[PDB]
């Protein structure tokens, strides 16, 4: 899990930046081949142990996961700052991709969202909750290969519980959260199915932001009235029906990822045949 700073070559070009610090492209020397990587680098502006613990917890989740539809961690490095080294997904975030490639076919979008459902079926089987499942957190290897990333808010579920109960509300992606998350601070794999519904909406809307113009509180009020976002232009009815089913208010009656992946799998094969 511990990498050698000597074997890592970082580019001066920064891929992105957040409050945690920066993300840079690089290459890591393996036993023989060189591997292209994406490196999350902590900001060493002010000494903060909270960011360090968050990065180490994220590394601990990623280490436990092994699936073709989840970003693989190479390891961690302690040098100029704390670094999390990941296998590079060259084409980047799904929302930004679709915003820049507006002629991507509905068949290709179905293919990518089904790949995300296969990854989520595996996380559910593994008893991990993602807690930040959104189009911005789906990364593209190619135009036909999506992976789930950003395990920053993820939790390994306790052996005696089907959900994680958050102690205090923090800076949350509220527009992607289910009513039991907002009302009871409870996060399950079914809560992640709700987020997946929002992710599907974003993908069929070519990366448009969900609940445009609205505040978090207005969304909660809208959902409580039984209202849901409309069908995006050109989105197949079967895909909009699936979004609405992910948006089941009551967590007990909402489907799990096994049911959602199967529904997406059969629709995809039907589209392939046409």
């Amino acid at each position: 899990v511990y990498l050698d700073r000597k074997l890592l070559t970082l580019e001066d070009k920064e891929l992105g930046s957040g409050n945690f610090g920066t993300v840079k492209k690089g290459y890591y020397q393996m036993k023989k081949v060189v591997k292209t990587v994406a490196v999350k680098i902590l900001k060493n502006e002010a000494n903060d142990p909270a960011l360090k613990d968050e990065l180490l917890a994220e590394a601990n989740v990623m280490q436990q996961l092994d699936n073709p539809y989840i970003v693989r961690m190479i390891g961690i490095c302690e040098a100029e700052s704390w670094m999390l080294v990941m296998e590079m997904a060259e084409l980047g975030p799904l929302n930004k991709y679709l915003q820049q490639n507006r002629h991507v076919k509905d068949k290709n979008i179905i293919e990518l969202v089904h790949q995300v459902s296969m990854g989520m079926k595996y996380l559910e089987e593994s008893n991990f909750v993602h807690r930040d499942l959104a189009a911005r957190n789906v990364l593209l290897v190619t135009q036909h290969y999506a992976k789930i990333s950003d395990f920053g808010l993820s939790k390994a579920l306790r052996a005696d519980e089907n959900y994680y109960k958050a102690q205090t509300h923090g800076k949350w992606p509220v527009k992607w959260y289910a009513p039991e998350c907002i009302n009871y601070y409870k996060f399950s794999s079914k809560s992640d199915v709700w987020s997946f519904g929002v992710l599907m909406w974003e993908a069929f809307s070519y990366g448009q932001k969900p609940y445009r113009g609205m505040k978090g509180s207005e969304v909660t009020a809208m959902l409580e009235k039984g209202e849901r976002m409309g069908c995006p232009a050109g989105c197949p009815r079967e895909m909009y029906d699936l979004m609405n089913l992910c948006w089941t208010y009551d967590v007990e009656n909402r489907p799990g990822f096994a049911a959602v992946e199967l529904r997406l799998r059969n629709y995809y094969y039907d589209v392939v045949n046409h």
Binding site: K171, W172, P173, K215
Partner: peptide, 6 residues
């Protein structure tokens, strides 16, 4: 706009 504090 994406992450809201309580």
């Amino acid at each position: 706009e994406v992450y809201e504090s309580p």
